Design a protein around this nucleic acid. Structure first.
Ligand SMILES: [Mg+2]
Ligand SMILES: [Mg+2]
Ligand SMILES: [Mg+2]
Ligand SMILES: [Mg+2]
Ligand SMILES: [Mg+2]
Ligand SMILES: [Mg+2]
Ligand SMILES: [Mg+2]
Ligand SMILES: [Mg+2]
Ligand SMILES: [Mg+2]
Ligand SMILES: [Mg+2]
Ligand SMILES: [Mg+2]
Ligand SMILES: [Mg+2]
Ligand SMILES: [Mg+2]
Ligand SMILES: [Mg+2]
Ligand SMILES: [Mg+2]
Ligand SMILES: [Mg+2]
Ligand SMILES: [Mg+2]
Ligand SMILES: [Mg+2]
Ligand SMILES: [Mg+2]
Ligand SMILES: [Mg+2]
Ligand SMILES: [Mg+2]
Ligand SMILES: [Mg+2]
Ligand SMILES: [Mg+2]
Ligand SMILES: [Mg+2]
Ligand SMILES: [Mg+2]
Ligand SMILES: [Mg+2]
Ligand SMILES: [Mg+2]
Ligand SMILES: [Mg+2]
Ligand SMILES: [Mg+2]
Ligand SMILES: [Mg+2]
Ligand SMILES: [Mg+2]
Ligand SMILES: [Mg+2]
Ligand SMILES: [Mg+2]
Ligand SMILES: [Mg+2]
Ligand SMILES: [Mg+2]
Ligand SMILES: [Mg+2]
Ligand SMILES: [Mg+2]
Ligand SMILES: [Mg+2]
Ligand SMILES: [Mg+2]
Ligand SMILES: [Mg+2]
Ligand SMILES: [Mg+2]
Ligand SMILES: [Mg+2]
Ligand SMILES: [Mg+2]
Ligand SMILES: [Mg+2]
Ligand SMILES: [Mg+2]
Ligand SMILES: [Mg+2]
Ligand SMILES: [Mg+2]
Ligand SMILES: [Mg+2]
Ligand SMILES: [Mg+2]
Ligand SMILES: [Mg+2]
Ligand SMILES: [Mg+2]
Ligand SMILES: [Mg+2]
Ligand SMILES: [Mg+2]
Ligand SMILES: [Mg+2]
Ligand SMILES: [Mg+2]
Ligand SMILES: [Mg+2]
Ligand SMILES: [Zn+2]
Lengths: 52, 50, 86, 122
RNA sequence: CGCGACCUCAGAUCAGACGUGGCGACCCGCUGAAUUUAAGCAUAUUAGUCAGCGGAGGAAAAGAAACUAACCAGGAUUCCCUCAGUAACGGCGAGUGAACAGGGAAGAGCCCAGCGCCGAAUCCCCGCCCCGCGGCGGGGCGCGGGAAAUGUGGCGUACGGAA
RNA sequence: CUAAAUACCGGCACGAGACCGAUAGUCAACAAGUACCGUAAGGGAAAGUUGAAAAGAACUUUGAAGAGAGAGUUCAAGAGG
RNA sequence: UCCGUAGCGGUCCUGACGUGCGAAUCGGUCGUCCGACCUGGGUAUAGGGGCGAAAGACUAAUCGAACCAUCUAGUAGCUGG
RNA sequence: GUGCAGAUCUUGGUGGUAGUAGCAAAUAUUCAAACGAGAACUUUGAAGGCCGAAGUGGAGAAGGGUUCCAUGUGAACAGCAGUUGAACAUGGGUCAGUCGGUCCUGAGAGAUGGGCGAGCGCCGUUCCGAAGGGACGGGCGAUGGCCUCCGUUGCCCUCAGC
RNA sequence: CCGGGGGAGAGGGUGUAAAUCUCGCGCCGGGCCGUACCCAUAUCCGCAGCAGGUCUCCAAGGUGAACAGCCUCUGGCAUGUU
RNA sequence: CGACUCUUAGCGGUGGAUCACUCGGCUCGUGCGUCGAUGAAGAACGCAGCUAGCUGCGAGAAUUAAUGUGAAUUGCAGGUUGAUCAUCGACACUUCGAACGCACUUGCGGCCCCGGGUUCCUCCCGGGGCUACGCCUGUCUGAGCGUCGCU
């Protein structure tokens, strides 16, 4: 669920979530767009997790 | 149609993933007989049932 | 009229994938399967088609419990014991 | 380091869960490296970490199941997974005790007329 | 009116158990044709066979005479040889068709109800104590609960049996 | 109520053959009840062989390339996926 | 109710085509076009059965008894080897 | 399971026909340049044309399932050719409280009770049924917190159509 | 989903008034599935890029009775397997 | 002479016959003779560093543990206190399916217990355990102008 994705991001990356928008790909996998709070910066979160 | 159900979309997802060619490194194997993928499917020719 | 012109009106389907046998024989309007007969508790099979029986028999699929049963039979179905450790 | 199943058995459940939650962080960090594109040394460590997690979870589940069968050792009613799983017809048989009863009539018949050991001269 | 029995019948996510479905070569209980043959065809034959349905087991079913016989008599059931393509059935046409005796493979016998006698002398379940504990059992306690006299258990069953 | 002698083209594990030898033998020696067809019940294939060992033809040259010509491997390319 | 468009249908040329665009199409010419009109989707009726403003029509290019499997390697005084 | 010339035999392969029939339904193309080994067919510009708002336009339903988009290739396919494609090979792409599904009932389908049936099962949908597990107010009982005042569930009285 | 008729009841003793409110603001949340593209002389069904079939929405100027025929604008295309 | 056509031979193509091989069938014989609500058979969907099919497996996902064995797996990379194989008795085993809360859209619940939310105040979110039918024994709560007995 979007709630589970929200509370999963909040525990693994210690960042709160504005909203979660999900879709299901034709691959079969579920893609989640997770919007952060206005005070947290998504690319500075992405740097410490590895994607750049 | 665009008004799919979850099980139909998941079946289409699997049949999309099985429609790729064989990797190049499998026919360098010792006990190998496969030349290509003979179970391939084109959307115009074979209409997948359903 | 009855042939090529009439084949253009085939746009709504009679059968869909059955949830018990996996074959596209679940008649949507009769709510029953022409392959296994899903709302019936017993699967449909007949002795007038030996070829249809051997497409769905105990040797056809994964046997993910029966093949462990066949291996466990050789030791009397021993249970709750371990081999002696080093 | 090589995570072995022999030295995880003496540990406590909480320090086992700590290692499990560390190795899951290791899998997430390796799967980020897989999708970003990383070294083959990082790519080949995924199978190593996955089997280590399988080892830790196997030890945890085996320990929990052994304590459950130690707790329910002397009880008449135990959970069905801890009950012996033979075949269904073999679980519906009679006991040793139940197949070893005989009636008072057959008891005195076996007592009064036992099967004798004998031989006949040629 | 109320209370208390018993009978009959309900409801429980009550406590503990069991059945469902699959496979189905072999087995048991039903149901059940028409091709075909009769140089036609309708009785018959195909054939209690194919198809259909239900139910099991490692085998199933059968089984210890309401039997065979007519003898100087044998003696549960199942299977093999023979009886025998015989007795018999049949538009007595086409065709169908056993059994007994005999020789073997195997061989094992038994239990109730009734009728009676014993203080229900019988059985199940829950709590506790110790043991066994991976086919849930053993003894010991419980002014613990039920089943059962509208009949449980022991003796006893046609070969007689009881006192 | 009751073992044994009796039945067994399904299952597990075996052994054997005056059987067949890739149009044969199971439909199926191979990614076979697979590919494919039919709405469906169902129908249902084709398809074995380099060499002892990939040693599976480096390099030169023409052509945009497929393709050649030399050279080379091998007992043999008159065995070149 | 009449002419007539879209729609629905299919008279005539017995035109084109007729190893065709097509296992029933095309062109001109035509019938009807406010009602017994046309049409999508849902639903009901299943084989000696359905359904039929009735042609033995339609019932998945199959209809004076659909299709699939089995009985079945049905029988043939007949044909071919 | 032993000898083929035939069975409109079975399977597989190959000829003549034959470089033949044919690539003729819906008015139409032309010039220059670019990329390239290669241009009647790709791209750009300039023309000349057609569909002419019941469209050869712009969006959906059913159906299809990646055909959508970007880049590369020109082996095979696209009945000439292709520098092109819905072909092949790599990668991407569908984000909802308000748009739909989800809810309701329609024609109808379909359990249970019951009945029938050798049997799988069938009929039947209120018909041969002890078919309501609910609520307010009160009494009783316990719980938890400014144990104040509400809330919670246990039992009884009461009320109840469908 | 709402309105009405009924009036079982509830609230406060003259106030830091009570029960109550379909009035104005203020706080929190709305989970699951589908969503791309074609929709037709080439993405569907007819063995195919098959003149066949397949349900809808929008509907400019002129001529003209007109959604007729003919020409044109927006948009589109290259003459329908050379 | 030449073209074209016919016959034969050499060589080369098209084609895959013949022969030789065979981890496959067919038949006979032997021993065992074992499925499932503790969830079968079957199906669906996923799982590999590079993985489509087949095979194997189930979120512990081409396997975990234990035992035997003893230096590999391999197409390419990467990394003896036991690599790989085999055995398999421990653990685990997603969804549908007799298929089990109600339905089969992957939709709607109910009860109880926890963790955030809150600070028991109901909401909201997440997790766990229950919630099918028939039937046996016992328990509990009941019904009857059924048969009675007593106040
Ligand atoms: Mg098509
Ligand atoms: Mg229909
Ligand atoms: Mg059955
Ligand atoms: Mg006795
Ligand atoms: Mg219970
Ligand atoms: Mg009969
Ligand atoms: Mg006759
Ligand atoms: Mg005759
Ligand atoms: Mg006749
Ligand atoms: Mg039969
Ligand atoms: Mg059964
Ligand atoms: Mg069995
Ligand atoms: Mg028996
Ligand atoms: Mg006899
Ligand atoms: Mg004789
Ligand atoms: Mg006569
Ligand atoms: Mg007879
Ligand atoms: Mg005799
Ligand atoms: Mg003897
Ligand atoms: Mg007695
Ligand atoms: Mg007797
Ligand atoms: Mg018996
Ligand atoms: Mg021998
Ligand atoms: Mg063959
Ligand atoms: Mg050969
Ligand atoms: Mg060859
Ligand atoms: Mg040679
Ligand atoms: Mg050679
Ligand atoms: Mg009129
Ligand atoms: Mg008129
Ligand atoms: Mg004509
Ligand atoms: Mg002609
Ligand atoms: Mg044409
Ligand atoms: Mg009828
Ligand atoms: Mg009519
Ligand atoms: Mg007539
Ligand atoms: Mg004659
Ligand atoms: Mg021979
Ligand atoms: Mg010949
Ligand atoms: Mg010509
Ligand atoms: Mg458009
Ligand atoms: Mg359009
Ligand atoms: Mg071409
Ligand atoms: Mg495109
Ligand atoms: Mg918004
Ligand atoms: Mg019904
Ligand atoms: Mg009033
Ligand atoms: Mg869109
Ligand atoms: Mg075209
Ligand atoms: Mg033209
Ligand atoms: Mg042109
Ligand atoms: Mg020659
Ligand atoms: Mg995979
Ligand atoms: Mg291990
Ligand atoms: Mg080891
Ligand atoms: Mg629905
Ligand atoms: Zn089915």
């Amino acid at each position: 669920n979007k709630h589970q994705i929200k509370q999963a991001v909040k525990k693994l990356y210690d960042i709160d979530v504005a909203k979660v928008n999900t879709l299901i790909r034709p691959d079969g996998e579920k893609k989640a767009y997770v919007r952060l709070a206005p005070d947290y910066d998504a690319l500075d979160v992405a740097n410490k997790i590895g994607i750049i | 149609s665009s008004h799919k159900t979850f099980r139909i979309k998941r079946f289409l997802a699997k049949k999309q993933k099985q429609n790729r060619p064989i990797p190049q490194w499998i026919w360098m194997k010792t006990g190998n007989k496969i030349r290509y993928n003979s179970k391939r499917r084109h959307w115009r020719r074979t209409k997948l049932g359903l | 009229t009855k042939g090529t012109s009439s084949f253009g009106k085939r746009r709504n389907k009679t059968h869909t994938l059955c949830r018990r046998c996996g074959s596209k024989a679940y008649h949507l309007q009769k709510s029953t399967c022409g392959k296994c007969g899903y709302p019936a508790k017993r699967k449909r099979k007949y002795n007038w088609s030996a070829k249809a029986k051997r497409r769905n028999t105990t040797g056809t699929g994964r046997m993910r419990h029966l093949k462990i049963v066949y291996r466990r039979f050789r030791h009397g179905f021993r249970e709750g014991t371990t081999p002696k450790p080093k | 380091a090589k995570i072995k199943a022999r030295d995880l058995r003496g540990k406590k459940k909480e320090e086992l869960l700590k290692q499990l939650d560390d190795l899951k962080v290791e899998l997430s960090q390796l799967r980020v490296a897989k999708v970003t594109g990383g070294a083959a040394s990082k790519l080949s460590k995924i199978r190593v970490v996955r089997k280590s997690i399988a080892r830790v979870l196997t030890v945890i589940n085996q320990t929990q199941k052994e304590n459950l069968r130690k707790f329910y050792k002397g009880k008449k009613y135990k959970p069905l997974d801890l009950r012996p799983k033979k075949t269904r017809a073999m679980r519906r048989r009679l006991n040793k005790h139940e197949e070893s009863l005989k009636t008072k009539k057959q008891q005195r018949k076996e007592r009064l007329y036992p099967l004798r050991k004998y031989a006949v001269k040629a």
